[model samples]
Target chain A: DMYIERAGDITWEKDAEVTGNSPRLDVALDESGDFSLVE
Target chain B: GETTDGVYRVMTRRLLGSTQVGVGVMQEGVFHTMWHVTKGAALRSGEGRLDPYWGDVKQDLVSYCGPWKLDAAWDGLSEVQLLAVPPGERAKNIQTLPGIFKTKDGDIGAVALDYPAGTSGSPILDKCGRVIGLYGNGVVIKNGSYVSAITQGKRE
Candidate 1:
């Protein structure tokens, strides 16, 4: 999803339960710098 | 896909994902981080300003489907052209269609299907060069204009 400009830092509360696993990697974007998906 | 009234810009993407046609273009392809399928209208270009309306709206789209995994559909639209067959013949007969429809509003990216006589798996393009949207159940076309909502393959 989009993190609107000037939106500042964002904090997320992970879903208690997912379809398969925890910390699943979907996709994310950042204009401030870079995003890395270790997986 | 059902046609709309009043001739408005169309987007058939019903979800937040994408599907590939032939080649895999994830690296240089687009990524839909967030879906903009709520416009309920068409999209346009605003030069430098953010026109964030229906015609000017943009979702979390990138040139690459993601940093990885997202598939590619044909390379740069050139490999289809590089084929040893005649461009006209291929466009008319083969499972290939050269997607280049230059219009005043925008260049429509038209795809050709070569299934059976009545069967087609043609992917539609927004034509303006960027509005990539999906058809029926397929989500691929995103940015520029009105693309065709094809109904051949699975919607997913």
Candidate 2:
């Protein structure tokens, strides 16, 4: 019988939205509340 | 960092029963699956679990192994039975060690057998589908004993 298989692939995508900022930025803002907005 | 897409294929000899074979195709990403294939089949099928370890990356990918089994000389197809799904985890890190590695690295993995040693049985085949050797320890069994009970270890 023909066995069905699934191959997985991973690719990197850039996070450009402010809501999707990195964990480091989010935590830094949360801890000190001293921040500058960056585009 | 090596960013090229690399492909790795593994050729495995079927053991008596199901065995978990883990291979790392990418750094920080490991794929684990049960290896169960029948003879002369174009495709072999098994359940696979993948763990990817990276920043904010926690997910599980459960998939089936391949169509490695070929057809018979003339007709009909080889079949495989998927028994269980792999566990859910991103990767085997410090927190995932005890669950993944049954033994230390560089140790002999476990094997299951239908018959005990010193018992009369058929020959075992190698990865190339050639008979390599016979079962061991056939003389130590008591009469009317269960084939499984006469064995020393449990099957995975």
Candidate 3:
């Protein structure tokens, strides 16, 4: 049951542990990871 | 595997004994050796001044996590420590919550969930637990919630 809500863009490695101490989740947009929406 | 680049030499120095004593001996020897090599041996002499707290010695960088490592503790079996709630969200009506409230000096980012919310009467487990605060009441999602607590500390 994937409650797939795109809080932000950039598809991560599907198997990666996306939760717990993820730097991407805590950091602000301009300061860290890059994201661009795809069609 | 990634391809290697240019030549790289990784050198390591092994201190024969405990870092506390080893570092002190190394520093003293190096300083004296440098003075001798440069023919400034006379400047190396100094009165034996041992600080009561040994403040002159550099601290050891090695860290020990203790015997009973808690990292292997099962999730959910252990209580949560810190929970970061977004700018807008209702605090959960959990039994207990223990965490530092994050807010600017002059700003009130959180509000107390009235005791009538059945929060105070909730059962707090034996582990360290206490209600921190509530967030977002006047805005949307009147019932959204977040909570935090710690399962263990220095004490039982």
Candidate 4:
């Protein structure tokens, strides 16, 4: 399923709702800065 | 696990207390994506512009499935290898064929990419790692993922 949620500030985690998936992270592009991801 | 390769997530400025998310491609120092992604996101005025109609004059014009360019530079952009698209039959091979033509050639525009939502502008790269098309909801087909031809305007 598609999962998008607020991570903090103007950033959001997207397309990262899978389990047992390695190298999968909540890739997000922040409004004020660069892009990053989380598990 | 390998789904994230070459995949980039794009987010628009908040609208109605929510932000829009979609896939985008960085090519030749510019970020390329669908116009609807930022249609009402309300970025600084003149930040980006959409392409003109690329269809038959008799058909719909405004909603052309073409590229949108962000004129201003953004910090985290990275370039991806893009396939060279010429005109004529080469172009036909990239566009989705329908009706009787569909049986002979199949939907060449469709790629085997299955991901979740917000992947509208994702790059449909080839086996050689070169971007061949762009994904969107309107072009989606069954089983395989359908992608629109990234022709005309900036990407042409």
Pick the TM-score winner. Answer: 4
**What is the alpha-carbon lDDT for the whole of candidate 1?**
0.21
Candidate 3, B1-156: lDDT as tens digits: 111211111111224321111100111111101100111111111232211111111111111111111111112332322222111232222221222222222121222222222121111122233211111111111234222111111111
Q: DockQ of every model listed?
A: 0.02, 0.03, 0.02, 0.03
Indicate the residue-level lDDT of B107 in model 3. 21
Q: Per model, how much of the real contact set is kept? A: 0.00, 0.06, 0.00, 0.00
**Comparing 3 and 4 on lDDT, the stronger one:** 4
Off by over 4 Å in 1: A1-39, B1-25, B28-95, B114-156
Once fitted onto the true fold, the runs of candidate 4 whose alpha carbons sit more than 4 angstroms away are A1-39, B1-7, B13-20, B40-108, B112-114, B139-156
Q: Best candidate per lDDT, number?
A: 4
lDDT of 4 by residue, B1-156 (tens): 111113334444444443435544444424444454444222221344423333222111112224333222111122222221211111111211111102121222222233344445554333234444454433333334432322222323
| CAPRI-style class, candidate 4 | incorrect
Q: After superposition, how far is residue B48 of candidate 1 from its true place, in Å?
A: 33
- Runs of candidate 3 exceeding 4 Å displacement: A1-39, B1-100, B105-116, B121-143, B146-156
TM-score of each: 0.21, 0.17, 0.15, 0.36
Candidates in descending DockQ order: 2, 4, 3, 1
Error of 2 at A7 (Å): 4.7
Considering chain A alone, report the TM-score of candidate 3 relative to the true chain A.
0.16
